[PDB]
Amino acid sequence: TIASSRLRLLEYSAFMEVQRDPDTYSKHLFVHIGPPLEAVDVRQIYDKFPEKKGGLKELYEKGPPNAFFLVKFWADLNSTIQEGPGAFYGVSSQYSSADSMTISVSTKVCSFGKQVVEKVETEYARLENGRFVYRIHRSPMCEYMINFIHKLKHLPEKYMMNSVLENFTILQVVTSRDSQETLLVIAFVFEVSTSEHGAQHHVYKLVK
Numbered sequence: 001t002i003a004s005s006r007l008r009l010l011e012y013s014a015f016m017e018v019q020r021d022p023d024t025y026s027k028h029l030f031v032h033i034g035p036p037l038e039a040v041d042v043r044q045i046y047d048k049f050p051e052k053k054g055g056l057k058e059l060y061e062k063g064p065p066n067a068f069f070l071v072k073f074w075a076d077l078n079s080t081i082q083e084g085p086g087a088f089y090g091v092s093s094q095y096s097s098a099d100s101m102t103i104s105v106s107t108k109v110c111s112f113g114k115q116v117v118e119k120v121e122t123e124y125a126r127l128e129n130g131r132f133v134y135r136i137h138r139s140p141m142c143e144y145m146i147n148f149i150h151k152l153k154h155l156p157e158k159y160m161m162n163s164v165l166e167n168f169t170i171l172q173v174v175t176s177r178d179s180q181e182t183l184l185v186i187a188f189v190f191e192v193s194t195s196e197h198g199a200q201h202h203v204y205k206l207v208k
Contacts, residue, residue, distance in 0.1 A: 001035055001037060001203050002033070002069050002071070002184075002186060002203055003184075004064070004066055004067035004183060004184045005064070005066055005067075006067070006097060006098075006099070006176075006181075006183050006184075007067075007095055007096070007097045007103070007174060007183040007184045008095060008096050008097070009033065009093070009094075009095055009184065009186070010093075010094035010095060010096055010133075011033060011034060011092065011093055011094040012031070012032070012033040012091070012092075012093045013029055013031065013032045013033070013091065013092045013093070014029070014030045014031050014032075014089075014090070014091045014141070015027055015028060015029045015030060015089075015090060015091075015092070016028050016030070016081065016083075016087050016088065016089050016090075016149075017087060017088040017089075017090070018081050018082060018083055018084065018087045018088075019086075019087075020082070026081040026082070027081070028076070028078075028079075028080050028081045029076060029198070029199055030075045030076055030077065030149070030199065031073045031075050031076070031199050031201065032199055032201075033071075033201055037069075037203060037204060037205040038204055038205065039204065039205045039206075039207040040070055040204040040205070040206060040207070041207060041208065042056070042060055042068060042206040042207060042208050043057075043208065045070065045169075045187055045189075045206075047113055048110070048113055048169045048187075048189070049108075049110055049113060049169060049171050049187065050108070050110065050113065050114065050115050050171075051113070056171065056185075056187070059173065059182060059185060060185075060206070060208065062182060063182070064182070065206075065207070065208065067182055067183060067184050067185055068185045068186075068187075068205075068206035069184075069185065069186045069187070069203060069204065069205060069206060070186070070187045070189070070203070070204040070205075070206050071186055071187070071188050071189070071201055071202070071203050071204075072188075072189050072190075072191070072201060072202045072203075072204070073188060073189070073190045073191070073199070073200075073201050074190075074191050074192065074193040074194075074195075074199055074200040074201070075165075075190055075191070075192055075193060075199060076193045076198045076199040077149070077152055077153055077158075077161065077192050077193070078193075078198075079153065088138075088140070089140065089141035089145070089146045089149070090138045090139055090140050090141060091136070091138075091139045091141065092136065092137050092138055092139065093105075093135075093136045093139075094133060094134065094135050094136070095123075095133065095134040095135075095174070095184075096131050096132065096133050096134070097125070097131065097132050097134075097183075098131060098132070099132065100125040100127070100132050101125055101132070101176050101177075101178065101183075102122065102123075102124055102125065102176070102177040102178060103122070103123050103125075103134055103174055103175065103176060103177060103183060104120065104121070104122050104174070104175045104176075104177045105120070105121045105122075105123065105136065105172065105173075105174050106118060106119070106120050106171075106172065106173040106174070106175070107119040107120075107121075107170065107171075107172050108170065108171045108172075108173070109142075109144065109145065109170055110168070110169045110170065110171060111167060111168060112167045113167075113169075116144065117142055117144050117145075119139075119142065121136060121139065122177060123135070123136060148168070151164075152164060152165070152192070158192045158194060161192045162191050162192055165190040165191060165192065168190055169187065169188060169189055169190075170187075170188035170190075171185070171186075171187055171188070172184075172185065172186045172187075172188070173185050185206075187206070
């Protein structure tokens with residue numbers, strides 16, 4: 001459901017993978033994404049992201065408005081896998097467009113509204129089934145996120161985890177590397193899952 005007029009998000013998964021033996025792998029999903037949308041006023045989350053030059057407010061005013069989305073995540077932080085050192089933490093995602101582009105995906109991890117980590121990945125269009133796809137497979141998490149997840153899991157109470165997550169946000173900004181044009185912007189906010197179903201998500205449309 002997360003698609004602008006120029007680019008669609010097909011998949012987004014953050015996961016840890018553990019090798020139990022050379023022929024056995026166990027994988028746990030923290031978050032995952034595979035209808036009309038309710039609108040949320042974008043002016044309300046300006047404080048949860050960098051608000052200087054290059055910030056959400058500037059980005060939105062630059063437009064286009066139909067490229068801005070808010071995604072609430074209930075992260076699954078249950079240890080359903082045994083772990084052990086050297087486990088693999090990663091993010092996998094796919095995009096698609098009607099037109100061939102070279103895109104730049106910026107992922108800004110934010111603490112208390114301040115950019116703490118930025119990951120920048122350039123991906124080149126692949127013609128596939130009439131359209132063009134962009135695949136970022138098994139992109140390794142920075143040690144910051146890995147340590148953050150660990151800090152969260154060591155907390156005795158899930159309400160304590162949600163307390164920490166209140167000031168944790170992620171801003172993904174996809175641009176056409178050519179024209180510097182904003183193709184897709186997704187703001188991420190987080191909670192810990194409590195349900196037996198596991199990780200959950202809810203998408204909102206950002207309006208002004």
